[PDB]
Amino acid sequence: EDNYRTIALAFLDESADSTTINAWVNEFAYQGFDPKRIVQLVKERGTAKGRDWKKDVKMMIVLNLVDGNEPESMMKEMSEKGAAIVTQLISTYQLKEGNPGRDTITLSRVSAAFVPWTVQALKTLSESLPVTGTTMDSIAGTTYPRCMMHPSFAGIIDLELPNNTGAMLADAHGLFMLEFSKTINPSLRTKQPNEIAATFEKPNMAAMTGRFFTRDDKKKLLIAIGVLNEDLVPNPAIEKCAEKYKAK
Amino acid sequence: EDNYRTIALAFLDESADSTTINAWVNEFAYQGFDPKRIVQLVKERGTAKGRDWKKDVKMMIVLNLVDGNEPESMMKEMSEKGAAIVTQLISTYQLKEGNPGRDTITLSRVSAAFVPWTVQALKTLSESLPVTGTTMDSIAGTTYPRCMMHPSFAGIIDLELPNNTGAMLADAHGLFMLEFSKTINPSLRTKQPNEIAATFEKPNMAAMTGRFFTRDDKKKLLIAIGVLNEDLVPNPAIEKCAEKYKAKVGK
Amino acid sequence: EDNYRTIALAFLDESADSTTINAWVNEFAYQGFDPKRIVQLVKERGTAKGRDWKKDVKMMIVLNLVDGNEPESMMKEMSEKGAAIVTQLISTYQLKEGNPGRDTITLSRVSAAFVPWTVQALKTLSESLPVTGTTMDSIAGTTYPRCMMHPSFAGIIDLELPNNTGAMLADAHGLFMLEFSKTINPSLRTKQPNEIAATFEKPNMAAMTGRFFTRDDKKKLLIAIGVLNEDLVPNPAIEKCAEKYKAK
Amino acid sequence: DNYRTIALAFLDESADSTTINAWVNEFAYQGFDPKRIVQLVKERGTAKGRDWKKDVKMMIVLNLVDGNEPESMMKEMSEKGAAIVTQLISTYQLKEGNPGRDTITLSRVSAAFVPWTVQALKTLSESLPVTGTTMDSIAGTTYPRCMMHPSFAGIIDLELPNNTGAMLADAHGLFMLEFSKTINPSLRTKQPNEIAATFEKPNMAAMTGRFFTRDDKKKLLIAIGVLNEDLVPNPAIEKCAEKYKAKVGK
C-alpha cells in the first residue's frame, strides 16, 4: 500500500494471460472490415426494408465523396430534401461511425466495397470534391486522373502487376492522399507529408492487399478506367505520379 | 448463394449519370449560414439570460472588427475586464471559432447578420482595424469609405443596381478585401492580387446574392451610409476605388 | 421575436457612440506595455521588500529564458528549492502570465525591459534554451549570435541605422523567431512560416520602435555585444545569417 | 530616478557563467517520477473502487498496441474497447504526450510498471508497431521480446561489469531506432546515428533513474532471461548490440 517501488516490483509476478491479453487487444485494436461483408449487409438490409438498394449505394457514395463520413452531422448542413433522403439511409442501412467495429456499415466503407462505381462517379464529381482535379492538375504536372482521387481507389491496385506499375499507382494515389487527409482532420496538416502517410499507409495497404478482388478483376477495372492499357502499360500521367511523389 | 464480389464488380457498368449525380450533389450540398437564423439565436439566447442582447451584439461586433473570429484565443491578450466580457459572450451565445456549421454563431456571423450596425461602427474605429483607414486611403487615391472596410459589407450590395453600379461597388470593396485577406491569411502575402481575389470570390458572392435583405433594403442602407445618393448615384470615391481594383486584378 | 430581418435593419438606428465604442476597444485590445514602467515596478516592489532586486532581475530573466512565461506551471516542474525561490518572486513582484495589465509584471516583460542583461546571459546558456545555438548554427550558415536569440533582442534594434543594417538585424532575429513561436505554441508548428511570422510582428515592431532606448543607446549596446564594429558595420556572420531569413 | 539609465546600467551588471549555470540547475525541470506514478494510479483507482492492478495491465496493453494518445485513439476501436478507454481516462486523469511530472500518461504507466510490461511483450509482439518478426530480421537472430518497448530502458543497470550494461543498451538501441522511426516518421528519412540522438537523452534518464536499485535490475533481467544467474548476457544480446553499432555511429 505504501512502498511504491515494491508495489511495482511485485508486478513481475502478476499474471499476464495471453488469452485475456489478446482479448483486450482484440477490443482495443482497430479492426478492418471485409468488403465482402459490406456488400452483403447493404443488400440484405436494403432488400429487407424497401427498396431499390442499388440506387442507395450510389447516393451513399456521392454523399461520402462530397460530404465525408459523418452522416449525422451532414444532415444539419443541407437542404430539407437532401436531409430527408439521408434519414432513410441511416435508418435503413444503420450507418454509424468512422472505423468502429466489424460488421457495421460506413459511407467510406461503402465507397470501398463498391469502388467500381466510385471510380466512375469521380469524373462527374471532380470539382465538388474537397481537393479538386483542377488543383491537382496544377499540383500535378499534367492531368491527374479523376478516377484516383479518393481513397477507395486503393482497393483496385495490383502491386503484383509487372514493372512495379502497381507500386507506381500507390505513389500516385498517395499524392492525392496527402491532401485528402489534411481535411478529414483540419490538422494534421503538412507535418512534411510523412506523418501524413503513416496516417493512411496502414489501411491503405490493407485495402491494396485485400483479396476481395482478384488480380484479374483489378486488371479489368484498371483498363476500363483508362488507367492502363491492354498491354498493361499505364499512361504517362501516372509516370508523372510519381518520382514526383518522391519529394515530400 | 450470391457472389458479393461479382455483385460489386457489376457496378462497373451500373449507370453513372452525370446529370443525375450532379443533381444529387445539389440536394446534398451545404447551405451556408442564414443571417435570419443568427438574429434569432442571438435574441433567443440573450433574452434567456435576461441579457440586453442588443448591446451584446454591439460588443460582439466591435470585438470582431478589432480582434477577429477566434475568441478563445483572443482572451489572453486583453485586459481583465475585457476577457471577462468575452467569457460571458462565448458562454451566452455559444460562440465558436472559424467556420463551423450553419446553426452555429460566430462573431463574424454576428457582424454579417447585424451589418447595419457594423457599417456604422467602422467609422468610429478605423484606426484600430487590421488595415487602417489611413492605409486604405493611401492605397486608394482618396478616402476609402470606412463603411466598406469589412467583409460583411458584401451583404448590403445590390448587384442588380443600374449602370453597373453594383459591379462597381463590389470592385471598390475588393480593394479593401485584398488587403484584409492578406492580413488574415498571410499565405497570401506572397501572392498577386488576382490570386488573392479568387480567394474571397465565392463567399463574397454568396453574400451579395443572399435573399435576406431586399433590394430595397440595400438601397436604403447604401444611401444611409452615404454610398449612394437618393438618386442611386454612387459616391465619387467608389469609382476611384473600383478602378484601382481593376488595375491590380486585371480587366 | 417575430421578424428577424426587420430587427436587423433596425440596428441602423441603434446607437453607436465612439466614446463608448472606443472604451470597449481598449478593454478588448492587447494594449502592450511600457518598459520604463516595468523597471519602475521591479525596483520599488522589490525595494519595498528587503529584496536585493537587482538579483531578482537576473534570476527572473534566467527563469524566463529557459522556462518560459508562466510562473505557476513552472513551480510544478522543478526542484523544491527552485520552486521556493520562484515563490518568492511571485509574491513580491506580483507576477502574472496573462492578462497583462500595463502595470502588470511578467517575466517576458522583465526580459525585455532589462534586455541589456538579457543579451549577456544568452551566451552562458544557449544550449539550455528551448532552441539551441547549435540547433541554430545548423539552420544558419555560421555561428548564430547567441545574443540575438530571444525576442527580447528586438528591443535594441535601430532600424534607423544606416544601410538598413537595422533592417538586416530584424530579419536575422526572425530566423530565431519563427523557431521560437512554434514552441511557445505547438499549434504554430503546423503553420506556414508566414502565419507564424505574423504572429510576432505586431509586438516585435512595438519593441523595435519603442522609445525607451535612444538610438544612441542601441548603438552602444549593439557594439558591446559584438553585433557591430564601431563603424556601425555588422559582422559577416549576420549578413550571412538572416539573409537566409526570407524564403519561408 | 532614471529607469533607462537604471536599465542600460544592466549592461555591466555581472553575468557569471557559473552563477547563471547554477541557476539553470535549481530551475531545471525534473522529469517524471515513477514512484509518484505508482502512487497516483493506486490512489485514483482505489478511490473509484476499481481493480487498479488490472487497470494498469489494460493501460499497458493499450499503450503497447495503440500508443500514447488516448482520446485520439478511441475513434478506431470497437465500442466495447472505446468504453474501457473512456473509463481509464476518467479514473486516472490521463493525458497525452509529454506533460508535467505530476501527470499520468499511458507511457508513464508502462514505465512505472515495467516489470509487467516486459512480460506482456512476449505475448503480443506481432501486434506491436514493429513486430517481433521484423525485429528478428533486423537482428539475424531472435530479438528478445522483453526489450521491445522504450520502458525496458528502465531496467538497465549501466554499471554491470564487462560493460554488459553498455552492451544491453546498444541492443535496446536496435529496437529503438526502428521504433522511433515509426512513432516519429519525420525520421525514417534519417540515418541511424541521427535517429539515435533523438532518444539518447530520454533513454539515458531511464537507465540512471534511481527508482529501482541495481539489485532489482539484476533480479528482473535474470527473471526475463536477459541475464543468467551469473550476470551473463544472453548470447543474442551481443549480436544485437553489434548490429546496432554497425547501423549507427559505432
Distance from CA of D155 to the nearest CA of A (A): 11
Q: Which residue bears the cell 515495467? A: D114
Residues of B in contact with C198 (CB under 8 A): 183, 186, 189
Length of chain A: 248
List of residues 6+ apart from D192 with CB closer than 8 A: D177, D247, D248
Dist CA C150 CA D181 (whole Å): 32
By CA distance, what is C114's nearest residue in D? Answer: D7
Inter-residue contact D145 to D121 (CB < 8 Å): yes
Q: Quick one: which H or E segment has residue B244?
A: helix B236-249
Q: Among partner residues B54, B80, B189, which is closest to C101 by beta-carbon distance?
A: B80
**Residues 6 or more apart in contact with residue C214 via CB below 8 angstroms:** none
Solving technique for this entry? X-ray
Pick from A56, A38, A203, A49: which is nearest to A105 by CA?
A38
Angle between helix axes C53-67 and C35-48 (nearest 10 degrees) is 120
Q: Which of D7, D23, D29 sits opposite C116 (nearest CB)?
A: D7
Q: How far is A112 from chain D (nearest CA, A)?
A: 17
Q: Are B155 and B206 in contact (CB under 8 A)?
A: no
| Residue A35 with chain B: CB contacts under 8 Å | 4, 8
Is the bond preceding A161 in cis, omega lying within 30 degrees of 0? no
Alpha carbon of A154: minimum distance to chain D alpha carbons (Å): 19
Q: Is D242 exposed, middle or buried (0-12, 13-18, 19+ CB in 10 A)?
A: middle
Closest Cβ opposite residue C11 in set B79, B86, B114:
B114
d(CA A151, CA A110): 12
The nearest alpha carbon in chain C to B120 belongs to C16
Residue A149: which of A111, A113, A187 has the closest Cα?
A: A111
Chain C: closest CA distance from residue D57 (Å): 28
Q: Which residues of B touch A67 (CB under 8 A)?
A: 28, 30
Among D51, D66, D76, D145, most A C-beta atoms within 10 A, so best to mutate, is: D76
With cell 554491470, the residue in question is D160
Helix (H) or strand (E) holding D245: helix D235-247
A11, A30, A194: residue with CB nearest D76: A30
User: Can you tell me the distance from the alpha carbon of C120 to that of B74, in angstroms, rounded to the nearest whole number?
Assistant: 34
In one letter, which amino acid is B29?
A: A
C-alpha cell at D76: 478506431
> Beta partners for C234?
C228
Q: Which residue's entry shows cell 467500381?
A: A116
- Other C-beta atoms lying within 10 Å of the C-beta of residue D214: 12
Task: List residues bridging with B234 in a β-sheet.
Answer: B228
Which residues of A touch chain D, with CB atoms under 8 Å apart? 1, 4-5, 7-12, 14, 16, 18, 21-22, 24-25, 27-31, 98-101, 191-192, 194-195, 197-198
The C-alpha of A119 sits at a distance from chain B's nearest C-alpha, in angstroms, of 9
Phi, then psi, of D227 in degrees rounded to 5: -125, 155
**Does a cis peptide bond (omega within 30 degrees of 0) precede residue C107?**
no
- From chain C, pick out residues whose CB is under 8 angstroms from the CB of B58: 14, 16, 21
Instruction: Specify whether the CB–CB gap between B79 and C31 falls below 8 A.
Output: yes
**Contact: A117, B16; criterion CB under 8 Å:** yes
- Which of C190, C191, C192, C196 to mutate: most A Cβ within 10 Å? C190
Phi-psi region of D128 (alpha: psi -120 to 50; beta: other; left: phi over 0): beta
All residues of chain C having their beta carbon less than 8 Å from the beta carbon of residue A183 are none
Data resolution in angstroms: 2.5
Residue B89's CB is within 10 A of a number of other CB atoms, namely: 22
Give the integer Cα–Cα distance in Å for B206 and B218: 15
Cell numbers 454509424 label which residue? Answer: A96
Give the residue among D132, D144, D126, D130 at the shortest CA–CA distance from D188.
D130
Cell 506595455 belongs to residue: C33
Which of B79, B241, B99, B250 is CA-nearest to residue B176?
B241
HSE-up of D31 (CA within 13 Å, CB side)?
Answer: 12
Q: Number of A:D CB contacts under 8 A?
A: 104
- The rounded distance, in Å, linking the Cα atoms of C188 and C179 is 10
The grid cell for C115 is 534586455
B213/C22 CB distance under 8 A: no
CA atoms within 13 A on the CB side of D214: 7
Phi and psi of A211, rounded to 5°? -105, 25
Are C166 and C205 a contacting pair, CB within 8 Å?
Answer: no
Nearest by CB: D3 against C40, C73, C74 = C40
Q: And the C-alpha cell for B220?
A: 436604403
Q: What is the DSSP letter of D234?
A: P
Q: Name beta bridge partners: D29.
A: C78
β-partners of residue C228 are C234
Residues A170 and A135: beta-carbon distance below 8 Å: no
| Residues 6 or more apart whose Cβ sits within 8 Å of residue B115 | B152, B153, B155, B156, C8
CB contact under 8 A, C116 and D17: no
Q: A touches D (3+ CB pairs < 8 Å)? A: yes
Position C203, amino acid: P
Residue B28: all three cell numbers together: 446534398
